[PDB]
Structures are given as C-alpha cells and as structure tokens.
Enzyme design. Structure first.
Site, short mmCIF file in Angstrom:
data_model
loop_
_atom_site.label_atom_id
_atom_site.label_comp_id
_atom_site.label_asym_id
_atom_site.label_seq_id
_atom_site.Cartn_x
_atom_site.Cartn_y
_atom_site.Cartn_z
N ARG A 269 16.20 -5.70 5.88
CA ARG A 269 15.46 -6.79 5.25
C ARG A 269 16.39 -7.90 4.76
NH1 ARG A 269 10.83 -2.83 2.59
NH2 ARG A 269 11.51 -3.58 0.53
N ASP B 112 9.65 -6.26 -0.18
CA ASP B 112 8.90 -5.77 0.97
C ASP B 112 8.58 -6.81 2.05
OD1 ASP B 112 8.93 -3.32 -0.32
OD2 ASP B 112 6.81 -3.38 -0.90
N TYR C 67 -6.12 1.49 3.19
CA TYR C 67 -6.90 1.03 2.05
C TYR C 67 -8.28 0.79 2.64
CZ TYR C 67 -2.83 0.26 -0.99
OH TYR C 67 -1.74 0.42 -1.80
N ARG D 290 1.83 10.76 -1.64
CA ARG D 290 2.14 9.97 -2.83
C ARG D 290 0.82 9.58 -3.49
NH1 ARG D 290 4.99 3.88 -2.55
NH2 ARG D 290 4.52 3.29 -4.72
N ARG E 115 12.23 6.03 -10.87
CA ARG E 115 12.63 6.66 -9.62
C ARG E 115 14.09 7.09 -9.73
NH1 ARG E 115 9.88 2.76 -5.01
NH2 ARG E 115 7.70 3.35 -5.46
N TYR F 249 12.96 6.55 -1.89
CA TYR F 249 12.49 7.14 -0.64
C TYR F 249 13.49 8.08 0.02
CZ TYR F 249 8.33 4.13 -0.42
OH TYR F 249 7.12 3.51 -0.67
N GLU G 225 17.26 6.65 -0.32
CA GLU G 225 17.62 5.37 -0.93
C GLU G 225 18.24 5.63 -2.29
OE1 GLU G 225 13.53 3.81 -1.16
OE2 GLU G 225 14.05 2.48 0.51
C1 DAN Z 1 4.04 -1.56 4.12
C2 DAN Z 1 4.65 -1.63 2.74
O1 DAN Z 1 4.68 -2.85 2.12
N1 DAN Z 1 5.12 -0.52 2.19
C3 DAN Z 1 5.73 -0.42 0.86
C4 DAN Z 1 5.06 0.65 -0.01
C5 DAN Z 1 3.58 0.31 -0.33
O2 DAN Z 1 3.52 -0.88 -1.15
C6 DAN Z 1 2.90 1.42 -1.14
O3 DAN Z 1 2.91 2.63 -0.37
C7 DAN Z 1 1.43 1.09 -1.51
O4 DAN Z 1 0.70 0.44 -0.49
O5 DAN Z 1 5.74 0.74 -1.28
C8 DAN Z 1 7.03 0.66 -1.36
C9 DAN Z 1 7.58 1.17 -2.57
O6 DAN Z 1 8.87 1.19 -2.74
O7 DAN Z 1 6.79 1.63 -3.57
C10 DAN Z 1 7.93 0.10 -0.29
C11 DAN Z 1 7.19 -0.03 1.06
O8 DAN Z 1 7.89 -1.01 1.84
#
Ligand code: DAN
Length: 370
Positions: free
Chosen positions: A41, A46, A181, A234, A297, A327, A348
């Site tokens: 990135r 994100d 969602y 999660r 975390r 993660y 991570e």
């Molecule tokens: C596709 C995407 O944006 N995934 C993101 C994910 C997501 O926001 C969450 O699972 C709820 O939708 O969250 C996180 C996070 O570190 O918490 C990083 C991911 O890059």
C-alpha cells in the site's frame, strides 16, 4: 515473560517506500517452499492499497530455517483502475493448480463509502499458476459467475484474507472463506456475515455457501474428521465466533461465541486457524493464532484445540510475540526437526510497520502434550 522461543523469527516485509499489510501464507508440500503474500500500500490506510506482493521461501532441512527470495509484485493480480486487496491463496492438490483469490476496488473508493451508500463496487478476482506461483495467468473477474444475483444484496464484501481450503470430499472441493455486508433491513445498517464460496469442479464454476447466522467479519476455515468444516470468524462481541458445517461448507448448522478466544474493541481483529495431524482419539487437531490483548491489538498468541471442534476444548494461549500484533496467517508444514508438527506463521507487527515470519513446532508451543 519472554515470548516463545521458536525455530525462526524474521521480518519478511518492512515499511519503506510502501507500507505492507494483510499477510497470507501458503505451504507447497511438493516444493518444500512457502508463499508469503501481502498487500503493498501507498500508506497504512486501507484505501491506499495498491498491489499484491509475494516472497517465495524455501525450507532447508539441515538448518531447519527458511530462506526467502526477494519480494516481487504479482503484476497479473489486478484490474485496470482497481486497487487489489485481500490475498487468499489456495493449492489444488489434485490438479496442481495454484489459485490466488483477491478483491479489486475502484481507485480509492472506501469500504465506508460503499456501506453508507449501500452500493457495492467490489470485484472478486483470481489469477492461477501451473508453475507454483512463479508466473500467473491473466486475471479473471469471478463476480458475475460467483456472485451474480446476490451482488445487489450486499453493500460490500471480501474474501479471506489468508489461505483457503480444499476438502477431502469426493470432488475435492475448493473452499474460499469470506464475508458480506447484507442489506436486510430498509432502515437498519446492513450486517456482515461470514460464508464460503464453493467450487466442486476445481475452480471452473463457483457457488455461494449460506451465511453463518451471526454478525461476523473476516474468517478462515479448516476441516476435521464425520467430516466437519470449522469456521472461525472475527466479530465485535469481544470474542470469536466459531461455526461448524457438516455439509461441506454449504451450511453452518451450529455457531457460537468462544469467550476463551478474546477479540479487542471496537470491532475485533482478523485471526487464523488450521488443522493438522494429531500426535495421538480425533484424527486432526486445530491451531489458532490471534492477538490476546483485550484492549488493543497486541501479544500474538497460539491456541490449541485437541478435541475439535469442541469450543470448550480450546487451550489457554501461548505467547508468540510481545507488543503490537495484528493480522496473521498459519500453515501446517509437516514434521519438524523435533519429530512434532511444524508450523509457519506470518503476522503484522509494530503498528503495521513490518510483517514477521514465525516458524515453530507443537513440541515448542505445547510441551505439556508431550
Ligand atoms: C477490504 C478491507 O478494507 N478490509 C479491511 C478490514 C475490514 O475493514 C473489516 O474486516 C470490516 O469490514 O479491516 C482491517 C482491519 O485492520 O481491521 C484491514 C482490512 O484491510
């Protein structure tokens, strides 16, 4: 106080001109090598995701260490004008084909924009390889075929992140963990639920398994043997959601919160789960890694389930890494140098400034079992 002494601990990715997040690990048994994937990135945010990178690691038996080749972009893993996210690798042991599933989102359109407007613009894609990840095919957009009619039913969605699963069923089905969602109420905010994409013809065609009847996000699946697919997801309930499917991923007839497996506020964190040959009644046991701190975390831990999928059989965690941890993705690597199951773990660390590779054995992590 010190974390677990392991066979190896090495940073495979570090912030530099780019930031790296969302690890995915895949072990290729016939190659004796690991594939470590991550999102490259422009920044830690994100929506600043761009491409997917990869490092191939080779396990050396004499030194029981993994040496990693230089990182390289998986150039083919992308759609014009879209940023690539969520690498989800899978190896089809029957055809030898390597799959890399991922989602592609237009420019910098955020997940929040899609949620607020209840308008999905996320795409499901894949690239395959017949030479074990060295070269990849052109991307194939699976959206139409795999999601189709349900596309308008979701505000957004994602797969993985992390390794997928191939069942030991008749068709050797491919299973890709995911979540969406769903637009359920005209007023209420769409609620996410985990589910699996399924393929019974080695990736030619796809179908959608049904949703876990729970408010869940990122998840991973594993199979235990009659034959059960355990899904670990999660959630924002301060605990992980675990569900079982006795019909190969199509439906999850049971699910619940595993309070023993903590999730930090406010919306939890992604975690990883895998099955592996039991050292002894059940055929396979489960290993799970995830942060163990209840406020943030941090403190990556490994948990063991010697009687899967029994939720109450989850052990107390073993400290794998101290401090900021997020993660992670696990892989069973076979027999270790000490005669016990070998594991590889990508995670991570340090406020998303590096991705660390950890390698250890069951003997090292849970000696009480020996
Ligand atoms: C596709 C995407 O944006 N995934 C993101 C994910 C997501 O926001 C969450 O699972 C709820 O939708 O969250 C996180 C996070 O570190 O918490 C990083 C991911 O890059």
């Amino acid at each position: 106080m010190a974390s677990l002494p392991v066979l190896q601990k090495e940073s495979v990715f570090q912030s530099g001109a780019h930031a790296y997040r969302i690890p995915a690990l895949l072990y290729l048994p016939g190659q004796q090598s690991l594939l470590a994937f991550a999102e490259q990135r422009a920044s830690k945010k994100d929506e600043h995701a761009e491409l997917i990178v990869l490092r191939r690691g080779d396990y050396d038996a004499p030194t029981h260490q993994v040496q990693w080749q230089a990182q390289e972009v998986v150039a083919q893993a992308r759609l014009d004008g879209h940023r690539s996210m969520n690498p989800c690798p899978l190896y089809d042991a029957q055809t030898g084909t390597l799959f890399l599933f991922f989602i592609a989102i237009p420019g910098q359109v955020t997940q929040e924009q899609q949620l607020q407007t209840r308008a999905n613009v996320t795409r499901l894609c894949q690239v395959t390889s017949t030479d074990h990840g060295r070269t990849w095919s052109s991307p194939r957009d699976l959206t139409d075929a795999a999601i189709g009619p349900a596309y308008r039913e979701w505000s957004t969605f994602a797969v993985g992140p992390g390794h997928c699963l191939q069942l030991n069923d008749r068709a050797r089905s491919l299973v890709v963990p995911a979540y969406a969602y769903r637009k359920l109420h005209p007023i209420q905010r769409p609620i996410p639920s985990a589910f699996c994409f399924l393929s019974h013809d080695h990736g030619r065609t796809w179908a959608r398994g049904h949703f876990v009847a729970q408010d869940t996000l990122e998840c991973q699946v594993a199979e235990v043997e009659q034959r059960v697919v355990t899904l670990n997801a999660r959630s924002h309930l301060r605990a992980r959601v675990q569900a079982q499917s006795t019909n190969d991923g199509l439906d999850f007839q049971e699910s619940q919160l595993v309070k023993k497996l903590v999730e930090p506020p406010p919306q939890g964190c992604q975690g990883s789960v895998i099955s592996f040959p039991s050292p002894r009644s059940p055929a396979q046991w489960l290993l799970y890694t995830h942060p163990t701190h209840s406020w943030q975390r941090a403190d990556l831990g490994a948990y063991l389930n010697p009687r899967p999928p029994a939720p109450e059989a989850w052990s107390e965690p073993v400290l794998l890494a101290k401090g900021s941890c997020a993660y992670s993705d696990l892989q069973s690597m076979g027999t270790g140098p000490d005669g016990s199951p070998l594991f590889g773990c990508l995670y991570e660390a340090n406020d998303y400034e590096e991705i660390v590779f950890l390698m250890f054995t069951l003997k090292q992590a849970f000696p009480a079992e020996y």
